[PDB]
Amino acid sequence: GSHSLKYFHTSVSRPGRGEPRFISVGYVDDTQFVRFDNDAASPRMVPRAPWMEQEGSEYWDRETRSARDTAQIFRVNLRTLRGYYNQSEAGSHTLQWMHGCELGPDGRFLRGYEQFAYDGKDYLTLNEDLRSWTAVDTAAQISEQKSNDASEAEHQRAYLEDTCVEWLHKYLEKGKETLLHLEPPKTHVTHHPISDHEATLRCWALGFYPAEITLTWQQDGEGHTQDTELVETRPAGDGTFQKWAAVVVPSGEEQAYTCHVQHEGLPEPVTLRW
């Protein structure tokens, strides 16, 4: 294995209707398990997975405060930024923050990271050593010194280094089933002819988990043709994903082509032919 515990926070200012929207979604690699939505009919931290249901009030209450406090600082933050940029309070802006920690295939801390973005762009990134910040703008520099004089990297590092890894562990456990279970790709090719002398071959991978997958169309030995149209992996809506690669072939030649499909839930790679 190799795992990650990561959160994504978003704050969007709402001019007319006061208080900015604050969303917060957490993940144990690829599986959302919690979320806070200050807009939701319940402004509280809720479980998004079922293995999370077996969690006591203490946790939910605590995490609810955390998200609430962040929402608060983020509201202060959005104000400050509106200032650094000399911006009207009548327009909307977005503050995003992503942070996560990763484990080694060997089960301990690997790397940790943290970043903020404003109006869609990088703003302040916590450095690799996890002891420093890189502003990306000059407003960001003010945020950068403010940050260092305050010692934020310090905190962030602790969390990132213990807390974060320690709980990832606990979550992997409570999600023993779901989380460590791989689902391979149902596979298949399809023919959709274009002209009198050529068709499209489409290699399909459906229902797989996790989402990392690799589809390749190669003809009789060598690799990658002139055109492999490859759609962004997508969600089926059930926990699994879908993906497909297409290539255009001259009729008759349809078996000169083979599609290879790679996926963790496959004891070994799979080859398809029309």
């Binding site: 917060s24 957490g26 933050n77 930024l81 302040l124 403010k146 905190h155 969390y159």
Partner: peptide
């Protein structure tokens, strides 16, 4: 758990 405290910018 999310991080206990966030950066003030």
């Amino acid at each position: 758990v999310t991080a206990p405290r966030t950066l003030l910018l």
